[PDB]
Task: structure prediction
Amino acid sequence: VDLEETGRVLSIGDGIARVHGLRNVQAEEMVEFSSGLKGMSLNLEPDNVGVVVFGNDKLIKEGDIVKRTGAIVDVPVGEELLGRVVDALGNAIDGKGPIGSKARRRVGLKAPGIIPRISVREPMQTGIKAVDSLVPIGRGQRELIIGDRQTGKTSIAIDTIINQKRFNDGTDEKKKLYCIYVAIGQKRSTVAQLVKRLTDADAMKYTIVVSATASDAAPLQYLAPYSGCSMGEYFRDNGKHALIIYDDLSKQAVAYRQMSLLLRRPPGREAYPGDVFYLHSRLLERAAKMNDAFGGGSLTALPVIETQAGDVSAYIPTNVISITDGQIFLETELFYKGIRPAINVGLSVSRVGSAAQTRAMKQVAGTMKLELAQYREVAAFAQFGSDLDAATQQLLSRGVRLTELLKQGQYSPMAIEEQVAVIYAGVRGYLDKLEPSKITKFENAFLSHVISQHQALLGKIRTDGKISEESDAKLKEIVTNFLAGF
Amino acid sequence: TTGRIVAVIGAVVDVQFDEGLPPILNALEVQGRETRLVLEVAQHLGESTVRTIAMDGTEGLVRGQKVLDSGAPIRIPVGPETLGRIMNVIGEPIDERGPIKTKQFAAIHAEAPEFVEMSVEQEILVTGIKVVDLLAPYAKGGKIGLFGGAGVGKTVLIMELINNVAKAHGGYSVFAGVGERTREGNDLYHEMIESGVINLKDATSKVALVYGQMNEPPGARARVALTGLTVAEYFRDQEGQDVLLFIDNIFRFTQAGSEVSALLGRIPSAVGYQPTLATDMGTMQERITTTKKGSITSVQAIYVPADDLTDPAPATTFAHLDATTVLSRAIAELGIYPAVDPLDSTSRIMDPNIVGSEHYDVARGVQKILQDYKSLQDIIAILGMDELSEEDKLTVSRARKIQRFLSQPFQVAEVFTGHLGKLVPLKETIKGFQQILAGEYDHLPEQAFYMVGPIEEAVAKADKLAEEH
Amino acid sequence: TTGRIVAVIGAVVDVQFDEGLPPILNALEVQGRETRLVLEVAQHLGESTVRTIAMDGTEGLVRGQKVLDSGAPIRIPVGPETLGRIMNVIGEPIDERGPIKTKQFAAIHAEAPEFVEMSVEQEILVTGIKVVDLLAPYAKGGKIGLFGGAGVGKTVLIMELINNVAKAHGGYSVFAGVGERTREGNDLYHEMIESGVINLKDATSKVALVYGQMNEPPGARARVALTGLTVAEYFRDQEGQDVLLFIDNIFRFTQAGSEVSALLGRIPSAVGYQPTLATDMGTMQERITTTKKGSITSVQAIYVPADDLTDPAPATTFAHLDATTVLSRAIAELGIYPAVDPLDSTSRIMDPNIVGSEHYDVARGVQKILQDYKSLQDIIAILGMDELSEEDKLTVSRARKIQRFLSQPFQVAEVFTGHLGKLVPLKETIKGFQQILAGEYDHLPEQAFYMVGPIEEAVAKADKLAE
Ligand SMILES: Nc1ncnc2c1ncn2[C@@H]1O[C@H](COP(=O)(O)OP(=O)(O)OP(=O)(O)O)[C@@H](O)[C@H]1O
Ligand SMILES: Nc1ncnc2c1ncn2[C@@H]1O[C@H](COP(=O)(O)OP(=O)(O)O)[C@@H](O)[C@H]1O
Ligand SMILES: Nc1ncnc2c1ncn2[C@@H]1O[C@H](COP(=O)(O)OP(=O)(O)O)[C@@H](O)[C@H]1O
Ligand SMILES: [Mg+2]
Ligand SMILES: [Mg+2]
Result:
């Protein structure tokens, strides 16, 4: 009998096989059970091995024979995945046939060092005004989306994914962005409706949906983010730009906690092992922006975190808040009073900042940020409204208009030039003489008008990437003329 | 095979075998019991020992007793014969009318529909309840949750939903009662018999009750959900028909696992819950789904321990529902019944495309006015309400009117309120809330809207109050 | 001697020697890795086994791999060739620029200088920054908290301190980026190269960067502070000079220690922090002192968890801080740089005995007048400006002028302001504030003081702005 390349299960239960033998098994190696089940060897102990089963332990008896595959976990990669729905290991689950990817990568590779990177400078357009202007996201960033239940996080992610269609359908090649959506611990029907939604917007020809749903064993939910991040590192390391969305990163932590507590590792705070920082840091540190010597590609990341009762001092929310280059709060109090997307712009930040905004959006959002900052510190008076001087009155009459410009609807991202035009109209002052309730209508009208007649001006803003004083004057004329006839 | 008991600790029994070993989830029958005791295998500890959870009280077990491996997981009767009956976790009847004689048996453990088998259609399911239909419309084939503290209206609301929908349903129905009062189980059984839904004489029953009430040891409360779910699975697949599945409560399915966890040798998780809470619940909630080969309109009541919606159990369940109606204790204190919280109940079909532009605009208007009222109450606390401006006294008055109008009298609450239960089709709700928002009822007192159906009834009640004044 | 990896549980590796064990804290080299994996010993389990914490990923470790006992704790190169070079906890260079060539090697687990070596006179490090040197003076061989997050001038202030201390004292600086974001680490490296503190060509760099990145096992983020301390201790003992030691962040140090302790299997303390929090902080913080050869002055960026100043981490840290500097956004908005908040910033040596009577009295005068102006700002915002006495208006003028005078131009932020940088010596700052307070300059305009060095330069500006 062989007890180096083969072993036999001493015990099983709750998904943690205890194997005896496998003396040559490496740590974090993929062994295979006699029942066609795979597993990952996590605990190497003097007397046994702790294997986490990728599936149901109903099929793992005691005394079964386990054979080591000799390789660390690896996943397929390539543009052969684009438009598919794969599971935590590359297996297709959309029933469109095999995947047919030549290459492979290791899920647990290390991030690029300090020299390969270069400072984040390109803008990653999310097509959401509140984000693209006030909390911008560059390429190579890691911008946490942290919020409560049903506040609109997945919708922010899907608007971002849908927006890139305008770039991916063009001919410019350094603006193309390929999206990956890792869906962790989600009802399968949610992922199915999401894939349908992406197909509707035709945004599923450059998207890879990695699916680790609720029924999946804990190791698959633990492993889905790394599978997605490897499929994204493939595009990063080939001069292409990627955007990976983990949704959520709290359920990966829960699955990891389950495996640890079943392997009997010292609990720690909230029963989370001591590796729930290392676990997330060594994942989120793979979002980079390689310099030209390494291809110039990049890989953005938008981890999604759910916070219970707006408690952002919990364990995992703070672990992932101290790792990332910003955060987009989504408060529900604002969600229900009309502000949708409910991006609290007080708590939201982007440590990258305006270094990742197009010169036009810099030109405009630079002053929009200050106008809203001033409004937010006299917001309380809004109820009293009267009994106050013209100074604060004008402050909170500009703030209300600016706020109502940032409202936006499901699955309808706006091109950067149109966001710039709308915010220009709003902040330069061509709206302070308008009843707030009508502002949205004006927007939804003005936008369309500009889209129809003045396409040349929008083209010039888009290409020049700046509001030249000639374009500035033309835009002022357009706004004045339209606002006159409203 | 045949093993022998070796240790009994609480509801956890270890059994040692000498023949082959029984795989996990198998059911082992203990030999020498007056009533069938079934142990469901749960762990292999090595040395041909298995740790198991007894589905029924382990009183009077003896070390060395003999245990026979049935050879397959708990198998339960299924088919159109279980309609009108009552079943244990192990499927044997508990309504004293003889055996459930079926052709079909099903194992209560079975994988979930694959991703290639899901449906993606959504059509509103009118329930006749103003708040539920307006702010958080349900959906045919969707999973629905009622998150409540203790004594807020979960059970009365689920009885109202049964009465309404199950009676007017072409397909079958199932009510799995997991670990809640036995008084309530008997009450429901008699209510159905007296309402024709169940029928003792002939084969015309549309409900297949299953009960694991709170006197069952934890091994049983943690499985009866799977048993009711298996009956619903069959009706969904083999009958190829629509199904309803009311579960009450789905917290006890987690609580029982927590109860047995420590004795199984597991380090406890955050709040004393088992480390496997999330997956032990996903493997269940992922079988309650519509598919291309059927449809289940599952409704589930969910205890929220101490009204703490951030507890791990409700917090984890929130992700498995297509629509949640968070009953609230604060609203129930104001006397508004149902207590549904308008600013916490959500849905997935509340979109301008799935329910229409006007419905969506009205729902969002209701939510926004209530939120504005919430903000105003802080000021009203200090200034008094006479100091409020005249654009806000209107807001407060309208918000109070809407709060009252969201209440409604159910047909199953006639014992409490005395009023007559009403159903408000969707059009009346949308029209009435449109009118209340527009200002077409600033001249009626707010109490005119308390516990009435359509808006015209509020007008009539206002007239009657005026006359009797 | 060679042992054999017997167990591998996460980042904790149990090795089994057969001839003789290595004392605790030694470094062991695992044989068979493409990279260099170093395990630091942590326990002596008995039966010749030692439990150890890995400095790198422990993926791919077989049960039986040979492990060579190095023979002493982690040893790094501590020559003067480190300056301008990035290195990681085990001392390898992580800037892919070639090996760090030095003739000296230092073991990172040292002990605090004995009681006899301690210096007893409490001096005052002169950073050359007016606000830092007047209201919250820094002390040689003292710990200095640095509050304020991003967007306020933390990196520019760090670079200015590095430059001034390397210029007005000849003493180098070390930057131990514990738990350092790779993006932020690269940005800091390039900002330094641009600003001249690091120089890639002419061997005149004033900074030694050490980076324990955020994606390294906890065993490596809890030791990088000791690598920084080792380099700085070399510059203090074997070159007898003053040193700056920046630690960004000091919270991530305690957190890394906490994770390591949890991994080893120790009962977590009060709020989940390791039981050894006090002495883990003490062993590190107690090597930053002014012995009889030189001094290490540590500037420790501090994060306060949950805005809770009594949390065990900051509570343990603040027992060691000898001063505090509070960068505040509300003063970057007003255009005053550095953003140092003159009132939140405090210091232990604001004591007439330590700094002197004239320095002390000037500092208290400035604090009193600024407090008074803060109080009067509310009344000006409520009852109007016209209802203030002559003395109140005079104090408002003095306070605005002092505010503007605290601002200074930094030689490293020239590309922002364009103004040539200044290094204000202590005595000049005291003179300028004495004069401004006594009223000698009641006859000058506010903007004459914005972004100027000595006071005489403010007078020159006042003249040139009326000609
Ligand atoms: N920009 C928006 N405008 C209008 N409604 C929105 C917007 N974003 C989200 N919503 C609404 O909020 C609800 C919840 O959206 P979403 O699923 O994005 O939140 P979530 O945080 O992903 O939910 P969960 O936490 O349950 O996954 C949806 O019904 C959607 O209609
Ligand atoms: N629609 C209603 N009308 C009047 N009273 C109600 C209504 N719903 C609940 N109540 C009151 O609140 C109590 C809550 O009990 P119930 O909802 O049956 O159990 P649970 O604690 O599961 O919610 C009821 O006994 C009843 O007195
Ligand atoms: N003395 C100063 N002169 C001019 N600009 C400054 C000064 N101090 C800070 N700033 C500005 O404040 C910004 C803050 O960025 P920096 O301090 O470099 O990084 P961090 O915000 O991480 O500390 C800088 O971009 C800089 O332009
Ligand atoms: Mg979501
Ligand atoms: Mg109940």
About this structure: Chain C touches chain A through 51 residues (CB under 8 Å). The CA atoms of residues 192 and 198 of chain C lie 5 Å apart. Residues 357-382 of chain C form the longest helix (26 residues).
